């Protein structure tokens, strides 16, 4: 039997790396901003 | 503009290059990656 | 003319699949997010 969903999400928030998550999310926001800027012209 | 372009058996090559550049703009819009992975 | 309509349909489907991410990116860019 697998784990329930909420303890799995809280454990993924508890034990994962913070710096890699921060860098990937910030570069994802940057890529979305470049897409929006390319759409605006 | 010209009535020669109104016929379907004659093509304007500059219009072809303009719309092909438009398709390349759609290609460069298709290059992006929008999956969250979080 | 239908092939260009299929291309526009594919572009619209790709844009409406990720409408929320582009909307939050434009909301951060336009400084309009309720904390």
């Amino acid at each position: 039997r697998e784990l329930p969903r909420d303890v799995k999400q809280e454990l993924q928030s508890f034990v994962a790396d913070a710096a890699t998550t921060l860098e990937s999310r910030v570069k994802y926001l940057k890529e979305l901003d470049t897409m929006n800027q390319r759409m605006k012209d | 503009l010209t009535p020669l372009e109104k016929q379907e058996w004659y093509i304007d090559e500059k219009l072809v290059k303009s719309e092909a550049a438009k398709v390349d703009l759609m290609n460069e819009l298709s290059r992006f990656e929008l999956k969250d992975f979080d | 003319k239908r092939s260009q309509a299929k291309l526009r349909f594919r572009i619209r489907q790709r844009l409406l699949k990720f409408q929320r991410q582009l909307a939050v990116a434009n909301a951060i860019a336009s400084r309009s997010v309720l904390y």
Binding site: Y28 | - | V24, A27
Partner: peptide, 18 residues
């Protein structure tokens, strides 16, 4: 799915941008 969480916080103006 972290970017879909903030979509409930966007003002109704730019919610329909594309």
């Amino acid at each position: 799915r972290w970017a879909a969480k903030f979509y409930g916080q966007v003002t109704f103006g730019p919610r329909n941008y594309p």
